C-alpha cells in the first residue's frame, strides 16, 4: 500500500506583525477611568 512506505517574511506577515505591535504599544499605558 503506497502509504506505509517512508517518504523570509512576506509583506502580509510584516503588516500583521506591525499591527500587533501597534496594539501592544497602546496597551502599555495607564487606562484613564471615565
Amino acid at each position: 500500500d503506497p502509504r506505509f512506505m517512508k517518504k523570509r517574511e512576506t509583506l502580509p506577515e510584516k503588516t500583521a506583525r506591525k499591527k500587533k505591535r501597534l496594539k501592544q504599544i497602546n496597551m502599555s499605558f495607564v487606562k484613564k477611568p471615565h
Partner: protein, 158 residues
Amino acid sequence: GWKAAEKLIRHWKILRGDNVMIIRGKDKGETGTVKRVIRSQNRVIVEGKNLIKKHIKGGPDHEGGIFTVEAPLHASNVQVVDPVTGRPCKVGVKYLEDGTKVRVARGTGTSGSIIPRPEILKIRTTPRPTTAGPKDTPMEFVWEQTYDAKTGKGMPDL
C-alpha cells in the same frame, strides 16, 4: 485629568496582604496592610488610610448620607516594612537552592532577610458552595470511564 504619559508596572514587588509604610502624602509615616491592588492605575489601597468623604444620594435600594471610604495611593508611595528592624526597605530578588524566586530586603542598613509572601492570597475571594445545585453532575458520575481505545469500549455507531 490623567495627563501624564505613564506606563504600566508589569511585575509587582508589592503584593496584596503585605505590611507597608506610607512614605509620601497626607498620611506620611503611618503603617498598614494592603487590601486591594488596582493594577490598571498603578495604585494600591491601604487598609484604613487615606480616607475621603463621599456624598452618596440614597434611593429605594441603597442608603444615603455621607460615607467615608479609603482612596487609592500611588504604588510608589508605599514601601515594604523590614520584618526585623521595622523600618521600610527596598525589595530585591534572590534565587534559592531549588531556584525559587523570593523577595529579600535590600538597602544599606537592612538585615537582608526574606520578605514572606502573605498568607491571604491562597484564601479564595469567592468561597466554594456548600451544596450542589439541581443541574450539577455529582463527582462520582464524572469520574467513571466508558471509553477505552485498546479494548474498543464505547466506539461509535460506524
